[model samples]
Target: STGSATTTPIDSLDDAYITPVQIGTPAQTLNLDFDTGSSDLWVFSSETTASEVDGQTIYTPSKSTTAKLLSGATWSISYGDGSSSSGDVYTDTVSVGGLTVTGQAVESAKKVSSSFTEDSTIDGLLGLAFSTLNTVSPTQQKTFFDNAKASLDSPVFTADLGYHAPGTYNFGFIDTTAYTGSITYTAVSTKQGFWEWTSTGYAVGSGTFKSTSIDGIADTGTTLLYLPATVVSAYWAQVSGAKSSSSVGGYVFPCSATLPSFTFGVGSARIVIPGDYIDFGPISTGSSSCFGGIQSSAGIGINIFGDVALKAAFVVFNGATTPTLGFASK
Candidate 1:
C-alpha cells in the first residue's frame, strides 16, 4: 500500500481514537480500526457522501441479516485532531476469522474525517482497548471484547501491531511464538484506566540507572515515550556526538554513531527498549536518525510510554485475571 505521500499519527481525542482490527469473512478480509476510547464499533455507511470513501466497505444494516438498530439512539465522536463523525447505534453479527460475536454493538457513521477517511483500505474500527473508554455506556452497550471473549477459546485478546508495517494487525489470541516465557505481571493502578507505573530509574546501555528517576503511565494508544526535559537531555548527552535538531515538534539526533540502549524500571521488573527502536526515520522523520527513549515533556500532565516502547516487548493488560499488567520478551 505504499504511495507517493507522507503520513503522521492521528491526533484523535484522548478517548475516541479507534484501534484498528482485521475483520470480514474468510472469503474477503478487511482491515479495520477499533476504538476503546469510544465504546462503539463504527464503519463507513452507504450514505457517506465523501469522495474519499468511494469503493470502501460501508456497513449496510439492511443487508446484514443480524442487524438491529437502537431506536432513537444517536452517537457522535470527536478526535483530538478535530475530526468528528456522527451516526446511530446499531447491532450486527461481526466476525473475525472463524470467531463470531453475535449482537455486537456497532456504530454506523454517516460522516468521517481524519487520516482514517483518507485511507480507503481501512474498513472500520473495533474498540477493544478498554471498557471505560467505551462510547455506548449506561444504555444498550457492550464492548467488542466482552462479546468476543466467550467466543474465543482462551477468553483473551492480544494486539500484535507490526510497528511500522501496514495491515499487520491481528487479534483473538496471543501468538505464543512471538514471546519467550511467562509474562511478568504488574497490577493495574486503580486511580485511572491507564497503565500506571513507578519508575526505579532508567539505564543507558545496561540495567544500571544513571541518576535519573521518572514516573508516568504506559499507554498503548501513544506512539512515543515522553520523559521529563532534564531526563531526556541527560539520555541524549550519553549518545556520542549526539546533537538535537527540530523534527516532529521534538529533537532528533545523530544516534547511529553510538546508539545508547534504554530501559525503564517498573517496580522490580525492568522493561528494555531494543536498539532497533532507537533507529528512527522509519516511524518518524525520514532521516536515518535516532531518538532518545526519553523526550522533553516538562509541562505535559503525565508521561506516556507509547507504541514505540511497547512494540519491543510483549505486554499483557490483565483486566480479566487481575487489575495488573504483565510484560515479557518479544
Candidate 2:
C-alpha cells in the first residue's frame, strides 16, 4: 500500500532548507528534506554543539518518547559541495501518516556545519528519491518508502511542483485528475547510482543541432541541468538571435522567438523539453546568454537532467520490484 501527503518547506538562517511532514503514533511531527542526490536518514542531536550546526533543523529526541540511539555504530558523509558531517547511529519507532515501523535506522550528527545546524524546524531528512544512492546498507537501512510501502494502498508515487508554487510530493498513487494524457514510461537501464541514459540528438525551435548522440543522467539531487560544452553550444547556436553572455555563466539566452523544443530519445521513449524550460530562469551570462535550464559542464562524463526537466513529468524509480525507470505526465 502507498499513499500521498503534503509537506511544507521552511527556510532557516544561513543557507539551510527543509520540509516538514506530519508523522508518528500521536502524529509527532518531523522536518526533512526531499533530497534525491544521496540516501540516508540523519538528524541533529543534543550532543551537537550549536556552533558546529547552523541553518539546519536539529531533532530533539527528548521531545519524542520513542527515539533511541544505537550504542556503538557511527556514521559520516560528505557531499559534492565539499561539506560533510559525522555522527552516531540510532533506531527508533518511526511513523509517517498511518504507517509505523520500529527499529528504523537513523544517524545522529555529532558534528555538523552551519549549513545543516541553524534551522529550528523539524529535524533530519526523509530520503524517498532513490535506493541505489542510499547511504545506509540494506542490513542497517530504513527508507521512507521502505517503511511505508506495507501501509500504503497503492504502488505509485507522484511529485507535482506547481508553476512557482510549492512542490507536492505524493506516494502510493498518481493523481489521475492532474494529468491530461496516457502515462508513458521509459525503460530503466541497468546502471549504478543515478539514472543514466543516452541522447539521440537535440532540436531547438525548427533547427536541429548535432546528430551526435550523448549519454546523460537524471538527478533530483541537483538543481540545474548540466550538459557537455559541445552539446550546449550547438543548441544555443540554433536559437534565433540567441547571444552568448557571461553574466549568468554562459548559459542564459535572451531570444524570445519561440525557441525550439529539445527531445532526448531514451531507447523507444522520447523525453521532450519545451522551449519554455530553457528560458524560465535568469540568464547566467550576457554574451552567450545561456538559459537557466542548460549550462556547460566542461566534458564532465555525467551530464545531469536536473529539476528543471523532472518537474514536467511524473518519474517512477521501481527499485522495490525491478531496476526500471518509468516516466509519465502529471
Candidate 3:
C-alpha cells in the first residue's frame, strides 16, 4: 500500500509544517507536525488542562471505541527549545492520508509547555524518525512508519517541503514525477536516532563551492538551517547590515539588505536556496530588522539541515535494513 499527504507551512516564516492525521476508531482529525528530528507520536487530549488547551484541537480517546489504554505506559519528551510534553499512552487506530495502522501507540498529553499551548494550529507531533528514539518506557513502542513498513510497497518515505506553499509526504514507492534529474544517494547513520548524513560542501551566493564534509541531520521539524560558525558567518558577512546580536539571538540584518543565494552540495549535485528565502521575515511585526534563515549551530554542537534546507529539494528517507538518504532537485 501507498499513502500521500499534503503538508502546509503553519506560518509565513514557514516556522513549521503540519499534516492532518486521523486518530481513533471514530476518526478525530488533528494537524500534526511531522518531525523527523524526534520519535514520539504525542497529542493534546482531553487529559490536558483546560488552561493549557488554548485554541488547538484535542484528541478525545473516550469517544473512540477502539482506543485501549496502554497500562502503566507513559512517555515524555523535551525539545531543544526547552519545551516539553508528557502523558499516559493508548493504542488506537491511526490513519494518515489513506494508510491506516491499528494499535498504533498514541501518547495523550497531560502536560505541555507554553510554546506548544500557544501554537493554535499545531496540535501535536508525528515523529517519522527511527523508533529507537521513542520516548515510551518499560516496553518501547514502534513508530507508525515502522509498523506500516511491512504493508508498504516499498520501505521508504519522501519529504517535499515547500517554501510558503503546500508540499507533500509520500509513503512506500517514490513518485518519480515529484522530482527532477537523478537522485544523489548517501549513507545514513541512524545511531543517533536521526537521518544523519554528511553534506559534501557549500557556497555563498555565486561563490566557489568549498569541498568540506559537513555532518548534519536532515530535520524536517527544525525551522532554520544551522551550520558551523565559520560557514554561517561567511553567509551573513555578504549582507551589509548583518550582525549576530545577543539581544535578538543568532544573526539578524536590516530588512532592506540584499541576501545572496546559498548552495549546498549533496554528493556532486548542488542545491541552491534562493536569496529571498534567506530573508526569513522581520524580527518583529513591523521591525526594520530581519532574522536570517541560516544561523550558527556552534553553540548547539551539531549542524542541522532543517526545513530551510530541505524545502530547496526533494528528500527521501529510505528505511531499508541499510538506511540511506536520497536527494534530488525538484
What C-alpha RMSD separates each model from the true structure? Answer: 6.5, 4.6, 0.7
Candidate 3 local lDDT, 232-258, one digit each (tens): 999999999899999999899999988
On lDDT, the stronger of 2 and 3 is: 3
Model 1, runs deviating above 4 Å: 1-28, 34-39, 52-56, 80-84, 137-140, 150-155, 163-176, 195-200, 210-218, 240-247, 255-258, 282-300
**lDDT value for candidate 2?**
0.58
User: Could you give the candidate ranking by lDDT, starting with the highest?
Assistant: 3, 2, 1
Best candidate, TM-score: 3
Per-residue lDDT of candidate 2, residues 81-172 (tens digit): 45667777667766553345576666777887555554455376666545555564324465666666655666445555433345556666
TM-score of each: 0.74, 0.76, 0.99
Candidate 3 residues lying further than 4 Å off, grouped into runs, are none
TM-score of 1: 0.74
RMSD from true fold, candidate 1: 6.5
lDDT of each: 0.57, 0.58, 0.93
Count of residue pairs whose backbone atoms collide, per candidate? 20, 42, 0
lDDT of 1 at 102: 67
